[PDB]
Design an enzyme around this catalytic site. Structure first.
Site, PDB file in Angstrom:
ATOM      1  N   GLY A  50     -86.039   9.349 -18.940  1.00  0.00           N
ATOM      2  CA  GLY A  50     -85.011   9.509 -17.909  1.00  0.00           C
ATOM      3  C   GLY A  50     -83.747   8.705 -18.151  1.00  0.00           C
ATOM      4  CB  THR A  51     -80.400   8.781 -16.457  1.00  0.00           C
ATOM      5  OG1 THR A  51     -80.745   8.610 -15.078  1.00  0.00           O
ATOM      6  CG2 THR A  51     -80.209  10.266 -16.761  1.00  0.00           C
ATOM      7  CB  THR A  52     -79.776   3.652 -18.003  1.00  0.00           C
ATOM      8  OG1 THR A  52     -79.901   4.102 -19.360  1.00  0.00           O
ATOM      9  CG2 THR A  52     -80.060   2.152 -17.940  1.00  0.00           C
TER      10      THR A  52
END
Ligand code: CL
Lengths: 235, 243, 244, 231, 250, 195, 240, 111, 241
Positions: free
Chosen positions: B29-31
């Site tokens: 996933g994204t940060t």
């Protein structure tokens, strides 16, 4: 083993696709819609000569204005018919009117995907639902175990379906009379059936606005068969 | 073998491979990050712009629980929403019975127990999210991070997602260079920088910055989104630091 | 999920057999032989205890022959624990019938009820069947003296003489040879013991390896008496018939 | 492979294959386009037939006076989800005398689809939805995936060959967003967008299906000779 | 969630074997030796207190348990399974008997209730069998003294004397030579200590042996006076000192 | 409903039951048969609150007919009566009890004896030579106490029944519109068409 | 509750559990049904592997569902009891609610519905039973004979057989039974039923059961001697 | 004791013409001798050219109208935007009212 | 080989899922120790904060179950907290129902019974934790009772748990072999904590700072944990002799 409601890598429900194979093994059923009425016809396919063929009930009344033919595992259709009849009569109770053919078909199709781990498997039977109402006139629907239903001008289901559907492709036009449609169902049934078509191993029916849904007598169908033979021999 | 096919099954190691596979979804996933400041907390997240057709500032990722808790997560977004919905039910029932708003450590355990419960049976799947959350209560500011296993701890700074290593390194510098502490407005600026620095791991597509914060002085201990001038000021500070 | 570990106890084989019922019958074939013989003036129940010990307390022991009510008894072949579950259900059913109709339960009705319970475990529930075969010996005023058997399939049948458990093939042949319709209880007692003496896997048939019972109209005037034989009484009937 | 038997199983790389297989069903489905301006929001759908005797399967469903969607994939699943939206839109009206916000409608669909991806026995939904609506914050367009992911967009497309229409909208972004107070021109842009996804077949009178909602325009569906204007 | 294991985990194999019961019996075989001997005027049950660590206080772990004032129990196999069975056995003695008839159940019927619980774990959904064999000694007015064995299958047998667990085969042979129908309780305790010494490796004393009896009524252990018909429990656990005294005359 | 009588003679059971059905101030019917055949040699008459009576009777009838088919055997009048009693004793502590009193007249083919059972709505069973329910017995029991012998013929039983009915017709304020009479014996159940 | 889907479709569109239930029927003892002009006869095989049997008390193969309808079967015996009980309950429930006894067609439709329900319900297997249901409708003199099977399909037959070696006896009936002129009397109908079983049975002793059902609830089971007279006459004519 | 019913007064009137129909009602809402409102609408346009008024207990009247309006909405969804005829609406309303036979809507209704 | 996935018997009469739960116990790589004084019961455990970003105050494997009972856990924190919450609920319910504070050994038995159920019922997995309960019981005095995933439990004079339990166990065994008593003959709890830390140092062979340890102390009518500064004072006293 594996889930009953499992998707295949192609994005199809395994069980629904397998039930469609069971329907291909079923006896042929054909429906043709015209502006004078909708005709429904079926192959009875008795497994033995001792079997009293008139007890084979593959064409069924849902309401006065809606009829129904079946193909596949015909035992599975009984609860579908029962629901359809209840739905039709219940709507008459609540709204003091006939129920739309589409609405009835939608009600039947809502049962289709109610399976999991509700019933344990999909239905193994396809239905041709034919009828008439004031809004959309004479209609013919094909209800599958996927929960999908398509409207058709003409449609064949069962073992000889793709061969019959190609024949219906060429023969159907928007100006067909009821008598012409009757002979057309008989013609195509005779073409795809294993045994020789007669009044005992095949059955006709229709739905008109005036007289409603009627299953044809074996004496009435016999004359239409004799009328067919003569008109094919005429050229 | 076959120990990794079913949830809640111990391998011969004493491991629950299904939970470890859920972590892989989180790492994909994204940060997202969290920063604990003097009198509150700051949350920030990386939103990948997949297309020009995405409406800017509309697809909001950070979620509020009650009025004093903020939640952000990385991984399977729907799983995070499901967890926050439960968090809101837990916070509501706590306030209903006990009157006071739920304390952050109390709230942290409510999520922890729920996530842990999804590692006890084969009839359920573990959560595909690591959740960074926190806020201000009677005892001050708190920041937490919660894993798929149900494991959580308190944090000075927290980070998860694809750019977690880069982020963690940046957070470690702030902890060392500011032992006396960091202000709320400073934390917002630093949060913007860290997301921009962590974007090098997702450098193919351009992104949108989203920040929120709870602070005793700046927001009266309530969760609020950083908007307008204060957001642009943080973006400018972030853009200046990468160049 | 849980599906992975399900044995599926209630399914057909390709040949149209119930796996678990067949395997349960295999289990029962290793159990101690039980014989039932019906005569004109009574019924005999004989059964062999499985490889006992000298330190087993026999006079207070019961693994084969059980009392369902005053008129009906059963011989067991299979898992004793499973049989006791069913026996207690049958005892209750008999008392329910007596409370409802104020008459002792007809033998067949009791047998059908237990056999229906067994059948249920083969068709639904996902549970293993009961690894038990019964011989029912009973009396009522409709059919008089009756012998029935039931097995894990839930199927039951009536008999003049029958065996269950181990060596039934050999035992049934011996019974079919020496049985006659005008036979009496004393003769049937002798036949039952002689059949066990020849079919037994043990070196010799002794009192300590047997359970025995009779249902006789040999009770003072028109009524029926159940006799569960004591160890000393089994020892005496073994000497009388000339086996020991 | 070994991890695609049910929805309750992650793969070693953290993937949910049953959800991905459900996503595949959408790609097999017929193309449908969504786009909006500041005043109106439009749905354009290519309907599919079984054969020449059959009817063209309906793609667009109305949820309320101010909201509705188009489908791509398993139609029965769209009927279930649209029925749920109808109920939720209706609960908002009856209880709060409040028209349901399109953004909140998306959040509800996300949460409904999610429960099916984490529990044993059930299955993911096998359909993708494009929800349009006009509420108190103007026009809206949403894209629903049965993984649970819901996204608010200016324009988009889903189904077979949907990449062509999506590229067109990505170029036209600055033009069609400005089409305010002109419903016909916004539909034209949608019909021109869906045309980029066509091969062999073209848009006929019983093939095309259009729907619109806006400032002073209730959610209405156009089929038959009502769309001959746009062919 | 929900318990979705509604199906049997113990099933018949092609050979007719119930695998899980056999495997449970194997677990019982690995367990520490325990035995029971019936005398004319009493019953004795005994076992080794196999301490897992010398830091552990082995007095806190009771292998020999009181079920009713006149019924006691000992086991071989899995300790935790035994502990819960004793809890259920104690409760069922009240719910299915004492609260109905106003008196404690006779040994054979309590045994029957325990057996039923163990049988149900052999057939019910989503459970394994209990991994224990029980020896239950007891007394009641109309049956006198009695000793029963209960296996994982739920089957139970009455014994004059017997042993279960690790060295049961050797111990049962030893008991066959020594047992007779004229044994006094003290003679049975003496034989129990002799039999148990053969299966014990390390220390053999009152602190490593657990031994209890069903014998005469103990009015000193009743806790109250004033009711002639209440004469006290027949179950008594022997102390560490009482065992050592009998080890000198061994 | 109103009057139901029963008398056991030497070789049969005779049941007499009123013909009237009444709703308030109006007689709806004057030819009502307040009885059901439970089995070929067992007849049950009934009286109580409207609906409850017929619902209960037909419920019992179905249960006995089911038993007969399942076992291919006719239950004894004693067994039937005990079944009926249990159903009523179960009923009395239910949410809405059946308000029905019954008489069961049967011929036991095993014992070759007629039998009459009186059961009220509470589930109170008693075997009798003669019985009645409601206010019927009040007028008739004095005549039955006087004239009854256990060795009476069926014809003598009917004459004593006529006397009982005549007394009811004189002293009861309510007009019950005569009675339907039925005889239960070894040959089955039959109705006396003239009374 | 145990919810497992046992009856499911396979890739080729077959429900194996239903098809394996038909194999249980194939294993079962032969049963035959023949309807004459004014009667129906049900014949049933009894396997002579079981002697020392008590024929008084052993469950008979033909069961009365009501006074005017009977049901015979082939397949699992224990399974058949459950169908028969349900049928008997429904028969009384019909009389109780509609004040008419069931028609043979209705009773068959009910039994067939039960069988079908067990092919798409969770946690249950199909009935390993096919039935022959025969009788006469109330106030009707037309004979009725129906057949059912595990899948749930049912149909009416002039004559039909089920069970082991049913293929052989059906072959016999197909050439011997004439529709234009069916067995005019009870004798002719019973004779044809016994003849058909003699193609398969082995010995004509205690292996053949016959049950004659006539109009107006007139049902009777023939004895050993009465049947033995048919067996004697058939073979004496055959010696020619 | 709590009384779940009340009387809000008011009066309504429906007359049918040859090609038209009217439904009238006063706008006064009351409890006992007090006036609650001098203008509180009581007759409503329910859609499909149907007007409705449920007079008596206002809370039950508002609930019934609200439900029937909702019934019209779902009639369109379920039956392809078909127009609900007046006779069909009437029958539907019977079932709304009788659904509470043992706790009635205390209103006299006219459409 | 599905007998290794759920809690059913293997042919050897073993429960592999229980055995693998024991192995999860050491996943944290932390060692704990418990000893009894005259008036108190002391429990110490290693504390390891590897990440600098962690708030070290929130990192703990010692739990205050009730006012009188303390619990240290050896195993992963999610299961540890699961057990802690349940034990707290049980202790509170016990007081409400029976009118007195739940004893340490009774709570241990209850938690052991719950663990036993997970070894018998298939749908529930065992918790990969070992629970060491400590208190000064009003009847039994200083108490240590330990529970494991098998459902086994027993009282202890002293005990140790973790990867290096054997080294600690033998060290303690040897001390009690000398003194010939079941406890640490010491008046104050401060000195009993010093004994516990000293003998862990000797057994493990590692020195400890204030942030390397975690200490719990049970006295009459209360259980409490020590702060970092309280532990520092304890470490200073050890070094000065
Ligand atoms: Cl407990």
């Amino acid at each position: 083993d594996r889930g009953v409601s499992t998707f295949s890598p192609e994005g199809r429900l395994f069980q629904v696709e397998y039930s469609l194979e069971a329907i291909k093994l079923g006896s042929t059923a054909i429906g043709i819609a015209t502006k004078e009425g909708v005709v429904l016809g079926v192959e009875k396919r008795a497994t033995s000569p001792l079997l009293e063929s008139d007890s084979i009930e593959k064409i069924v009344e849902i309401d006065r204005h809606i009829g129904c033919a079946m193909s596949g595992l015909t035992a599975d259709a009984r609860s579908m018919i029962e629901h359809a009849r209840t739905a039709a009569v219940t709507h008459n109770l609540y709204y003091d009117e006939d129920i739309n053919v589409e609405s009835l078909t939608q009600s039947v199709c809502d049962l289709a995907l109610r399976f999991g781990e509700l019933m344990s498997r999909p239905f193994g039977v396809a239905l041709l639902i034919a009828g008439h109402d004031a809004d959309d006139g004479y209609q013919l629907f094909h209800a599958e175990p996927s929960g999908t239903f398509y409207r058709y001008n003409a449609k064949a289901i069962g073992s000889g379906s793709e061969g019959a559907q190609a024949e219906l492709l060429n023969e159907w036009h928007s100006s067909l009379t009821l008598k012409e449609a009757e002979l057309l169902v008989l013609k195509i049934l005779k073409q795809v059936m294993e045994e020789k078509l007669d009044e005992n191993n095949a059955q006709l029916s229709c739905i008109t606005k005036q007289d409603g849904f009627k299953i044809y007598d074996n004496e009435k169908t016999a004359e239409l068969i004799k009328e067919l033979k003569e008109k094919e021999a005429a050229e | 073998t076959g120990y990794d096919l079913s949830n809640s099954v111990f391998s011969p190691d004493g491991r629950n491979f299904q939970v470890e596979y859920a972590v892989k979804a989180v790492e994909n996933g994204t940060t997202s990050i969290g920063i604990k400041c003097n009198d509150g907390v700051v949350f920030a997240v990386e939103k990948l712009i997949t297309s020009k057709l995405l409406v800017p500032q509309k697809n909001v990722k950070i979620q509020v629980v009650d009025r004093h808790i903020g939640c952000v997560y990385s991984g399977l977004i729907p799983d995070g929403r499901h967890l926050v919905n439960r968090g809101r039910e837990e916070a509501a029932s706590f306030k209903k019975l006990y009157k006071t708003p739920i304390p952050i450590p109390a709230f942290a355990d409510r999520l922890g127990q729920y996530v842990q419960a999804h590692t006890l049976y084969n009839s359920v799947r573990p959560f595909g999210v690591s959740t960074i959350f926190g806020g201000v209560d009677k005892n001050g500011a708190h920041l937490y991070m919660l894993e798929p296993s149900g494991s959580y701890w308190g944090y000075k700074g927290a980070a998860t997602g694809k750019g977690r290593q880069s982020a963690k390194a940046e957070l470690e510098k702030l902890v060392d260079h500011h032992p006396e502490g960091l202000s709320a407005r400073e934390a917002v600026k630093q949060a913007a920088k860290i997301i921009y620095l962590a974007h090098e791991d997702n450098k193919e597509k351009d992104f949108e910055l989203e920040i929120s914060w709870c602070s005793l002085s700046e927001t009266n201990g309530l969760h609020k989104f950083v908007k307008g001038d204060l957001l642009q000021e943080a973006i400018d500070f972030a853009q200046k630091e990468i160049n | 999920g849980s599906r992975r570990y399900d044995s599926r106890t209630t399914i057909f084989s390709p040949e149209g057999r119930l796996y678990q019922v067949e395997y349960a019958l295999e289990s029962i074939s290793h159990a101690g032989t039980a014989i039932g013989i019906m005569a004109s003036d009574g019924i005999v129940l004989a059964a062999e205890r499985k490889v006992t010990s000298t330190l087993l307390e026999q006079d207070t022991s019961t693994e084969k022959l059980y009392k369902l009510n005053d008129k009906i008894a059963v011989a067991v072949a299979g898992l004793t624990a499973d049989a006791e579950i069913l026996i207690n259900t049958a005892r209750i059913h008999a008392q329910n019938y007596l409370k409802t109709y104020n008459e002792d339960i007809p033998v067949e009705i009791l047998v059908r009820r237990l056999s229906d319970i067994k059948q249920g475990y083969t068709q639904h529930g996902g549970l293993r069947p009961f690894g038990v075969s019964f011989i029912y010996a009973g009396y009522d005023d409709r059919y008089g003296y009756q012998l029935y058997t039931s097995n894990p399939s839930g199927n039951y049948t009536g008999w003049k003489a029958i065996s269950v458990g181990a060596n039934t093939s050999a035992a049934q042949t011996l019974l079919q040879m020496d049985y006659k319709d005008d036979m009496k209880v004393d003769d049937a007692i002798e036949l039952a013991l002689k059949t066990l003496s020849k079919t037994t896997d043990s070196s010799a048939l002794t009192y300590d390896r047997l359970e025995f019972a009779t249902i006789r109209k040999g009770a003072n005037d028109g009524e029926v008496y159940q006799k569960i034989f004591k160890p000393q009484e089994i020892k005496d009937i073994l000497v009388k018939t000339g086996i020991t | 492979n070994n991890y695609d038997g049910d929805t309750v199983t992650f793969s070693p790389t953290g993937r949910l294959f049953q959800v991905e297989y459900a996503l595949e069903a959408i790609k097999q489905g017929s193309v449908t386009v969504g786009l909006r301006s500041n005043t109106h929001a439009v749905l354009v759908a290519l309907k599919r037939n079984a054969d020449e005797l059959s009817s063209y399967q309906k793609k667009i469903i109305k949820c309320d006076e101010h909201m509705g969607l188009s489908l791509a994939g398993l139609a029965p699943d769209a009927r279930v989800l649209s029925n749920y939206l109808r109920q939720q839109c209706n609960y908002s009206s009856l209880v709060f005398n409040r028209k349901l916000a399109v953004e909140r409608a998306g959040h509800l669909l996300c949460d409904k689809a999610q429960k099916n991806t984490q529990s044993y026995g059930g299955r993911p939904y096998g359909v993708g939805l494009l929800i349009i609506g006009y509420d108190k914050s103007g026009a809206h367009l949403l894209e629903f995936q049965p993984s649970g992911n819901v996204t608010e967009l200016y324009g988009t497309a889903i189904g077979a060959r949907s990449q062509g229409a999506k590229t067109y909208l990505e170029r036209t972004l600055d033009t069609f967003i400005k089409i305010d107070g002109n419903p016909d021109e916004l539909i034209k842009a949608g019909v021109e967008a869906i045309s980029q996804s066509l091969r062999d077949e073209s848009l006929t009178v019983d093939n095309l299906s259009i729907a619109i909602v806006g400032k002073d325009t209730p959610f209405t569906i156009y089929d038959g000779e009502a769309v001959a204007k746009y062919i | 969630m929900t318990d979705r294991y509604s199906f049997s985990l113990t099933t018949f194999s092609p050979s007719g074997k119930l695998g899980q019961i056999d495997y449970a019996l194997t677990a019982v075989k690995q367990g520490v030796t325990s035995l029971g001997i019936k005398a004319t005027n009493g019953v004795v049950i005994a076992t080794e207190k196999k301490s897992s660590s010398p830091l552990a206080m082995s007095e806190t772990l009771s292998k020999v348990s009181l079920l009713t004032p006149d019924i006691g129990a000992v086991y071989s196999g899995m300790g935790p399974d035994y502990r819960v069975l004793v809890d259920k056995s104690r409760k069922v003695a009240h719910t299915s008997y004492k609260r109905i008839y106003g008196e404690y159940p006779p040994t054979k019927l309590l045994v029957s209730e325990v057996a039923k619980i163990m049988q149900e774990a052999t057939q019910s959904g989503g459970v394994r069998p209990f991994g224990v064999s029980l020896l239950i000694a007891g007394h009641d007015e109309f049956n006198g003294f009695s000793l029963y064995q209960v296996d994982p299958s739920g089957s139970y047998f009455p014994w004059k004397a017997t042993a279960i667990g690790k060295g049961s085969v050797a111990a049962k042979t030893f008991l066959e030579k020594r047992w007779n129908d004229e044994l006094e309780l003290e003679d049975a305790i003496h034989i129990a200590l002799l039999t148990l010494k053969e299966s014990v490796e390390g220390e053999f004393n009152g602190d490593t042996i657990e031994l209890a009896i069903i014998g005469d009524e103990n009015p000193d252990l009743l806790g109250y006076t004033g009711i002639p018909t209440d004469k006290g429990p027949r179950f008594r656990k022997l102390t560490s000192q009482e065992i050592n005294d009998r080890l000198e005359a061994l | 409903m109103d009057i139901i009588l029963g008398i056991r003679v030497q070789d049969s059971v005779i049941l007499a039951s009123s013909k009237a059905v009444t709703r308030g101030i109006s007689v709806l019917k004057d030819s009502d048969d307040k009885t059901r055949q439970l089995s070929p040699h067992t007849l049950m008459s009934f009286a109580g609150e409207a609906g409850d009576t017929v619902q209960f009777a037909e419920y019992i009838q179905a249960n006995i007919q089911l038993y007969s088919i399942r076992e291919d055997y006719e239950l004894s009048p004693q067994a039937v009566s005990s079944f009926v009693r249990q159903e009523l004793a179960k009923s009395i502590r239910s949410r809405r009890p059946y308000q029905v009193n019954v008489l069961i007249g049967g011929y036991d083919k095993k014992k070759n004896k007629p039998e009459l059972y009186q059961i009220d709505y509470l589930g109170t069973k008693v075997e009798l030579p003669y019985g009645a329910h409601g206010y019927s017995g009040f007028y008739t029991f004095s005549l039955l106490d006087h004239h009854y012998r256990p060795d009476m013929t069926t014809e003598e039983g009917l004459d004593l029944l006529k006397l009982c009915v005549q007394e009811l017709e004189k002293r009861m304020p309510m007009d019950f519109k005569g009675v339907i009479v039925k005889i239960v014996d070894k040959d089955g159940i039959r109705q006396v068409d003239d009374f | 509750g145990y919810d497992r889907a046992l009856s499911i479709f396979s890739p080729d569109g077959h429900i194996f559990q239903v098809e394996y239930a038909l194999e249980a029927v194939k294993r079962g003892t032969c049963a035959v049904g023949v309807k004459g002009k004014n009667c129906v006869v049900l014949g049933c095989e009894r396997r002579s592997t079981l002697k020392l049997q008590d024929t008084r008390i052993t469950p008979s193969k033909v069961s009365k569902i009501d006074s005017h309808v009977v049901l015979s079967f082939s397949g699992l015996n224990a399974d058949s009891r459950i169908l028969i009980e349900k049928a008997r309950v429904e028969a009384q429930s019909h009389r109780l609610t509609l004040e008419d006894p069931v028609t043979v067609e209705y009773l068959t439709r009910y039994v067939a519905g039960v069988q079908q329900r067990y092919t798409q319900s969770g946690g249950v297997r199909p009935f390993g039973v096919s039935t022959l249901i025969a009788g006469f409708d109330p106030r009707d003199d037309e004979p009725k004979l129906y057949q059912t099977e595990p899948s749930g399909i049912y149909s009416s037959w002039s004559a039909q057989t089920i069970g082991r070696n049913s293929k052989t006896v059906r072959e016999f009936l197909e050439k011997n039974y004439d529709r234009k002129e069916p067995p005019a009397t009870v004798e002719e109908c019973v004779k044809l039923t016994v003849r058909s079983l003699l193609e398969v049975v082995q010995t004509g002793a205690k292996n053949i059961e016959i049950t004659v059902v006539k109009p107006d609830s007139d049902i009777v089971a023939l004895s050993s001697e009465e049947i033995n007279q048919y067996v004697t006459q058939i073979e004496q004519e055959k010696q020619e | 004791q709590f009384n779940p019913y009340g009387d809000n007064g008011g009066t309504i009137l429906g007359i049918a013409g040859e090609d038209f129909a009217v439904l009238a009602g006063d706008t006064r809402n009351i409890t006992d001798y007090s006036i609650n409102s001098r203008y509180e609408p009581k007759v409503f346009d329910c859609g499909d050219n149907i007007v409705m008024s449920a007079n008596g207990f206002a809370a039950d009247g508002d609930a019934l109208v609200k439900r029937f309006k909702n019934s019209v909405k779902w009639y369109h969804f379920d039956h392809n935007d078909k127009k609900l005829s007046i006779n069909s609406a009437a029958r539907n309303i019977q079932h709304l009212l009788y659904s509470r036979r043992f706790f009635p809507y205390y209103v006299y209704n006219i459409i | 080989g599905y007998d290794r996935h759920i809690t059913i018997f293997s042919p050897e009469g073993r429960l592999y899922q229980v055995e693998y739960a024991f192995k999860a116990t050491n996943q944290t790589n932390i060692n704990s120790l418990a000893v009894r004084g005259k008036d108190c019961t002391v429990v110490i455990s290693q504390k390891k904060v590897p990440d600098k970003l962690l708030d070290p105050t929130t990192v703990s494997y010692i739990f205050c179950i009730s006012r009188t009972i303390g619990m240290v856990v050896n195993g992963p924190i999610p299961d540890a907290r699961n057990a802690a919450l349940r034990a707290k609920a049980e202790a509170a319910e016990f007081r409400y129902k029976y009118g007195y504070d739940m004893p340490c050994d009774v709570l241990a038995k209850r938690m052991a019974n719950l663990s036993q159920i997970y070894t018998q019922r298939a749908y529930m997995r065992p918790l990969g934790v070992i629970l060491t309960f400590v208190s000064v019981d009003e009847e039994l005095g200083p108490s240590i009772y330990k529970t494991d995933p098998a459902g086994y439990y027993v009282g202890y004079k002293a005990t140790a748990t973790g990867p290096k339990q054997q080294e600690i166990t033998t060290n303690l065994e040897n001390h009690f072999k000398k003194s010939k008593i079941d406890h640490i003959n010491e008046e104050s709890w401060e000195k009993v904590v010093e004994f516990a830390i000293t003998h862990m140092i000797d057994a493990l062979g590692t020195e400890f700072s204030k942030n390397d340890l975690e200490v719990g102390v049970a006295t009459k009518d209360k259980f409490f944990t020590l702060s970092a500064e309280n532990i520092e004072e304890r470490l200073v006293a050890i070094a000065e002799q």
